[PDB]
């Protein structure tokens, strides 16, 4: 709930650039980093210090090497010069019981075009390109079993291990530092901005208040910081007297209550 690999391959990378890289995620946190240059899977953030079972990052590295070759191979089975982008979303989510729910979608040049029918063990899709790659992987006659293994056993075993040896990393809670400022804009009008700095998890609400009366949300924005935390802002246009009758309400798991905020 949930572990996800973001695989990407490109058919003609600029030099310096890797042709194929992957990032593993646990919820909204990156735990894994891989590319085809270094060719090794390595931990991210606090996950460097997670107590693993010592052959763990070896098994991650082999699986992603297998998947590296399957991806570059896909470009050969295509019939243009493109260039091409292949993308895969693989992983799992622990269910409403203690069985796992597989995800395996694929995308070509930014358009979803393929998936993995687990109840048959095949890649499927309407497209000639989908059918081409599917057949080609289906032939590297190890790969459908491996893929299957990966999603049904590997992936949901890794998730539990992390859920147990890193549970604290996932429960992490950090309130945002808040600010509310007004700037000059069009004559008659000023812009209000309620900003939220360094919070975790991503889930957060910013809403404005006309006097105590509800003023709507504003126009939201939202981004990551370098440390895995997050940023958010949300703005409103108001006319140029009448700004101190507005305030902001934030709510987030790292607070015991919705926190009002004045100018």
């Amino acid at each position: 709930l949930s572990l996800l690999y973001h695989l990407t391959a490109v058919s003609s990378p600029a030099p310096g650039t890797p042709a194929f890289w992957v990032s593993g995620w646990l919820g909204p946190q990156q735990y894994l980093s891989y590319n085809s240059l270094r060719g090794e899977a390595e931990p991210c953030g606090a996950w460097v210090w997670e107590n693993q079972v010592s052959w763990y990052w070896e098994k991650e590295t082999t699986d992603l090497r297998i998947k590296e070759k399957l991806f570059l191979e896909a470009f050969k089975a295509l019939g243009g010069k493109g260039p091409y982008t292949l993308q895969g979303l693989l992983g799992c989510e622990l269910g409403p019981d203690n069985t796992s729910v597989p995800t395996a979608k694929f995308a070509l040049n930014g358009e979803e075009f393929m998936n993995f029918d687990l109840k048959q063990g095949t890649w499927g899709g309407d497209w000639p390109e989908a059918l081409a790659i599917s057949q080609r992987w289906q032939q590297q006659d190890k790969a459908a079993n491996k893929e299957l293994t990966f999603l049904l056993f590997s992936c949901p075993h890794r998730l539990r291990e992390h859920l147990e040896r890193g549970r604290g990393n996932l429960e992490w809670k950090e309130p945002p530092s808040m600010r509310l400022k007004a700037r000059p804009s069009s004559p008659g009008f000023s812009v209000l901005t309620c900003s939220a700095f360094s919070f975790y998890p991503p889930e957060l609400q910013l809403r404005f208040l006309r006097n105590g009366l509800a003023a709507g949300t504003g126009q939201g924005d939202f981004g990551p910081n370098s440390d895995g935390s997050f940023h958010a802002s949300s703005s409103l246009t108001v006319k140029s007297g009448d700004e101190h009758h507005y305030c902001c309400i934030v709510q987030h798991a790292g607070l015991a209550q919705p926190l009002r905020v004045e100018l």
Binding site: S23, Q30, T85, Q87, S195, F197, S198, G223, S226, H231
Partner: protein, 99 residues
């Protein structure tokens, strides 16, 4: 498809003059993945800027984050300059000290 990038510029902690900080350029929702990002100080391209791993979102569009250690000043300006195929000229987004 080709998707044209969204650009956000913000700091990691509220900006107090004289206190050390981080500046961010979040670029997102773009396709394909090749992109070029410089951070600027009154026009001048910043040397030791770092960046995260190029990732994508649920809709398969790419995002990426560039960051740099710095110390804000009431009369210092920052901006992000981005170049991507879907654009005629590189776009410069000024850092609004709140957004």
């Amino acid at each position: 498809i080709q998707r044209t990038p969204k650009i956000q510029v913000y700091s990691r902690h509220p900006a107090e003059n004289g206190k050390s900080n981080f500046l961010n350029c979040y670029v997102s929702g773009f396709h394909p993945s090749d992109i070029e990002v410089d951070l600027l100080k009154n026009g001048e391209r910043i040397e030791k800027v770092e960046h995260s791993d190029l990732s994508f979102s649920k809709d398969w569009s790419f995002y990426l984050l560039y960051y740099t250690e710095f110390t804000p000043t009431e009369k210092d300006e920052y901006a992000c300059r981005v170049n991507h195929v879907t654009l005629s000229q590189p776009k410069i987004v000024k850092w609004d000290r709140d957004m």
